[PDB]
Each structure stands twice: as C-alpha cells, then as structure tokens.
Amino acid sequence: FLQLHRHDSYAPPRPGTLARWFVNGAGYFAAVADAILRAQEEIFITDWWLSPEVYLKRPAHSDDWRLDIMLKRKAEEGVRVSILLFKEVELALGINSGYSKRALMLLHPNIKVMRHPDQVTLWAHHEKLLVVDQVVAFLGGLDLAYGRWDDLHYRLTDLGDLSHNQFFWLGKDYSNLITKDWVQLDRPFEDFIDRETTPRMPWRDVGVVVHGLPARDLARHFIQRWNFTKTTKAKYKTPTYPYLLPKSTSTFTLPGGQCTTVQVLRSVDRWSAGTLENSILNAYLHTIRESQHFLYIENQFFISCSDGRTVLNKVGDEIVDRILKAHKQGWCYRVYVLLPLLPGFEGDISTGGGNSIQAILHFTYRTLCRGEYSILHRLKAAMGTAWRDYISICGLRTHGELGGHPVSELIYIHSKVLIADDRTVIIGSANINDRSLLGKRDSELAVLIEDTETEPSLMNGAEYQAGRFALSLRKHCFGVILGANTRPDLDLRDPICDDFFQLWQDMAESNANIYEQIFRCLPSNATRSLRTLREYVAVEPLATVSPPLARSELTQVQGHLVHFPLKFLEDESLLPPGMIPLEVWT
Numbered sequence: 001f002l003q004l005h006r007h008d009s010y011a012p013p014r015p016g017t018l019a020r021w022f023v024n025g026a027g028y029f030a031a032v033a034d035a036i037l038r039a040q041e042e043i044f045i046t047d048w049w050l051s052p053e054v055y056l057k058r059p060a061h062s063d064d065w066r067l068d069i070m071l072k073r074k075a076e077e078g079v080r081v082s083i084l085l086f087k088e089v090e091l092a093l094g095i096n097s098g099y100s101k102r103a104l105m106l107l108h109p110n111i112k113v114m115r116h117p118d119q120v121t122l123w124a125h126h127e128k129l130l131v132v133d134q135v136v137a138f139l140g141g142l143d144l145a146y147g148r149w150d151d152l153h154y155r156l157t158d159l160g161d162l163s164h165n166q167f168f169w170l171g172k173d174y175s176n177l178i179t180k181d182w183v184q185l186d187r188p189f190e191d192f193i194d195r196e197t198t199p200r201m202p203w204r205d206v207g208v209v210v211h212g213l214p215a216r217d218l219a220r221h222f223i224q225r226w227n228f229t230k231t232t233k234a235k236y237k238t239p240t241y242p243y244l245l246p247k248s249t250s251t252f253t254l255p256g257g258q259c260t261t262v263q264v265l266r267s268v269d270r271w272s273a274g275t276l277e278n279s280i281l282n283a284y285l286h287t288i289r290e291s292q293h294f295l296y297i298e299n300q301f302f303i304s305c306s307d308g309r310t311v312l313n314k315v316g317d318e319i320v321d322r323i324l325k326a327h328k329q330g331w332c333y334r335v336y337v338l339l340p341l342l343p344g345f346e347g348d349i350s351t352g353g354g355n356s357i358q359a360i361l362h363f364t365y366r367t368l369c370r371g372e373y374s375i376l377h378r379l380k381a382a383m384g385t386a387w388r389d390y391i392s393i394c395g396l397r398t399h400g401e402l403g404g405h406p407v408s409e410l411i412y413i414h415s416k417v418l419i420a421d422d423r424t425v426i427i428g429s430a431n432i433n434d435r436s437l438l439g440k441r442d443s444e445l446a447v448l449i450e451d452t453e454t455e456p457s458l459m460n461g462a463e464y465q466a467g468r469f470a471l472s473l474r475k476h477c478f479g480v481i482l483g484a485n486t487r488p489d490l491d492l493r494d495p496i497c498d499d500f501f502q503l504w505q506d507m508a509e510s511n512a513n514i515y516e517q518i519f520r521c522l523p524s525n526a527t528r529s530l531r532t533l534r535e536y537v538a539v540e541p542l543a544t545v546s547p548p549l550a551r552s553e554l555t556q557v558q559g560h561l562v563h564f565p566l567k568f569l570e571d572e573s574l575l576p577p578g579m580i581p582l583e584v585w586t
C-alpha cells in the first residue's frame, strides 16, 4: 500500500479473486440482501442516494428484505453499519439525504450515518459501495435507491399490509426520470406519477461483487473517507462516530464467483478524501490502448475528446487513435458504444428538453459527430464512409401496452462498464466524462477485472480463448439487447466478425425505424431543428391512432437495440446562454 501501483492506484492487482458480475438490479439487490443477512461484525455503505424503505427482493410480501428493516435487525445483533451519504445542495437536487440519515440512525444506535460535503460545491460523492466484514464488497452503478430495481423484462407497467402484494415497484419506486422528479421522499408508499397513464422508465445497470483482498482494498477506501469526514464537522468529531480501522490483508462466499485478477480503482480528491487519484481514468486509457480486437462500452454519459479547455479527458482520443491504428493496419476492430437515448433528467422532450437535457446532448454530440474534435469527424477525415465498420453508437428502447394501446419508452442505460477483447472488464460508478474521470471532482470507484481462465470462443472466425468472466458478461449483454431468447439461431460467439456486425447494425437500424414509424418517439433523426420538432409532435402517432395496426408492426421488433440518432436537433446550438461553469455538465 506504500507506493502507487498499476495505473497509479492506491491498491495493487489481486490475483485469485472470485468475482461475480450483475446486470440490472434484481440480482444485485438480492445478492446484497443475502450478504447483509450473513454479516457478523461490520457493514460499510457509500451511496450518492440511499432510499431507506427500498425493498431488495420483489414482489414484497412483508417488511423482510426492506433495506431499513434488514439493517435494523443486523444492528440489533451487534453489527455496526457505517454509512456515508452524499449531502446534496438542498432544494437544488432533491434526494433528501437528511431524511435518509434521520430514518437510518433512528433504527438502532449501532447505525451511524455521516454526510459530506457541507461546503457549497459542484461535486458529489458518487460511488456506490457495500462492504460486509471487509471481505465481501459490492460496487458498480446501482445505488440502494428508488427506480434502480429492474430485470431483463424491462416492464413499462406495474398495475397488478402487503401480504398478497403484486406491485414490483411500490409507491416512489415507480418512476419515470424524464416525466417527473421525485418528491416527498418521507412518504414512500405514495405514488407521485399515475400508473394508469404514465409508464415507468426501465433502469439498466451493471454491478459486481468481489471477495477477499479487493474487498479489503475497497474497505480501505471507505475507512479513509470515514476518518477524513470525521475531521470535517464539529459533531462527527464526537466519539459517537468512532474511528474505523482496516483488517490486515494477510487474513461466507457469494454463489457466482469466477476466479479473476481484480484491481480496485478510484477517483478521489483532497476535498472528497485526503489525496488525489484518477486511476479509473488511467485504466480506461490503458485498456483502450492495449485492446486488440474490440471495445464494448455501456455508459450513462459519453463526454470526452479533450477539446477547448472545457472537456479534458482523453478517452475519446484513445478510441480514435485505436480505430485509426486498426484501420491503418487493416485489422478487424469494433467499438460498441451504448448510451441512453436521453439524459436522465426531468424535461419535456416534445419541446426539446430542459436545460439539463440540452446541455448534456451538446457535449455528447460534440464528442461523437459534431465539431472538429468529434470522433466521427476525425474518423471520416482519415477513412471516409469506412467509419461505419469500426464504431457503432446505439441506445435501448422497449414497448408495452398501457391504456389499451401500445406505449414506448427508452431503457435507461445507467451502466458504467467497459469490455475489451472478451478478457478485460471495468465495472464501477464512473461515467465517461470529466466529472467522474478527472478525480479532482466527483469521487468514484471502479474495479479492473482481468481473466486468468478461458473458454473456447471465436474472434473474427478464428479460434480464441476468451476469459470466462468477460465473455459471459458480454454474451449476456448481447443476448438481452438483441432478444436472443426468441432468436436462438443468432450466434454470439464472435463479437467482431462482419456477419455479426452487420446483423448488429441491421437490427439497430430496423428497430429504430419501426419505433419512429409507430410511436414517433424522440430523440430521432426526423427532427433536425426545434422548428421541425414543433410541427413533428403535433401529429398523433399510429400507436394511438390504430392500436391494432400498431401492434401488427411492432411484431417485427427484435431485441431492444436502436441506432443512436446523431442528427437530432442538428441545426441547433443546444447550450444554455448566466454565471455558471459549463463543467457542471462535462
């Protein structure tokens, strides 16, 4: 721990670590609940937002598996739960961390909660972490909060004492991020949107659990922030908030662990902790530089391409350099970029979205295809139309039935995962933007997972020994996205061969065409200006005009993959005109 290690990390790589990945929140929360049940001494929790009354197993038939009830039972047995909540700037965010603290600490005297920061600041504590006995640690993109629970069904509806409850999302757990922001979080079992007209917005995320040494390294990170935050206020200096100490590295298991080499990475600053680190960014660049075959990226944000003193991280540049290197050498290389169709902010898309939606879309489009720094502009300059062979930018969307007619909604990609060559994976809370990767701003956590055990697989039609952890995760991502359960003829062994890549491009193009034609949903390439947008949304979509005819054409949708519309509001500027740094959204 003395020096910095690989990628300038505070923790060295840990071989022989059993790690299990999770996709969506159903498995992650159920695994967390089972690990909490087996806790004997200590539980560490860091959350950007923690909802005290959230259920970890669904459908809820009792108060068992509710997060507050579980921690209260564990504390009654002598288990100390130390929780680090991010303190929002109140009535400017709305997670009501004050209520979360008050609810948690009143459960039992063994549950201590601290909040950081008190000073006015733009940056947040964004890492999500649960560590049990310093031996079992959960991390990834999932907060123990409302709306995060979901499975591969991605249901848009939930219409159904709770002895026979059929509601998977109870009260404030049923939400649509773009429709309405959360309100009155101290009344959890009251709806704040109408289930009979407004569909929920599905949550797609990635998480991971590691055991042994990497959990000690993550527990070390928690302990440092705990002892540091103790010196930040007058009240936490009290002995009711004891100092925390790590257990020595020299010293139950979750079912699902693959033997891997795991290295913990982090983004911390002397405001968030006591030192500076950006090992997550370092691991991202190195993994892209040393990739040999493909990159699979699933991120909530994609803001990069260090340009004009506004965006500084070089993740986009490394992708361009790697694609140009593959193009020069003429080798088979693919980059899959999966993003949410819209940023997860409340706004009226039929008007063009709010300030937040527009600000994020500006830097996102500036990163991908608009301007001389964008990935596509630099790629077209060197290879012309051939860029379509190396990079694919897509989103996810699903459809359902509500009110007697088809309804559609995007699936919110909150994951922060990178897969390389079916051998290397990065899972954490860090978005691809300056706020997460620089370290000087938001505090983030991640793990670098390298496979030491392989399976027979394919790579551009050649025999390939792919890592078990990475290949299983990548295949599960491909299968759910492409709807492989209904199409078993699809071969997911080879991720870069031309036959699969065209099928990937064709399905994303085809699905986006059907959703546009049926739902006239946004974002879309059909509205390149706010003036065309005002006329576009005036027409009633076929989904409500003739639901029978809508359903007949929705039978041709396969999977959830849709092409990301790169020309949406292409003729507009998309940047709020008062006294605010643009690094708020970068």
Ligand SMILES: O=C(NCCN1CCC(n2c(=O)[nH]c3cc(Cl)ccc32)CC1)c1ccc(F)cc1
Pocket: 049, 093, 094, 095, 122, 123, 124, 126, 177, 181, 182, 183, 300, 344, 345, 431, 435, 442
């Ligand atoms: O959970 C909510 N929405 C989901 C979409 N958001 C989630 C967090 C995400 N995010 C980052 O990735 N880094 C951030 C830094 C900061 Cl300071 C703030 C957010 C950050 C951005 C998108 C929500 C909860 C309570 C409400 F009242 C309203 C919304």
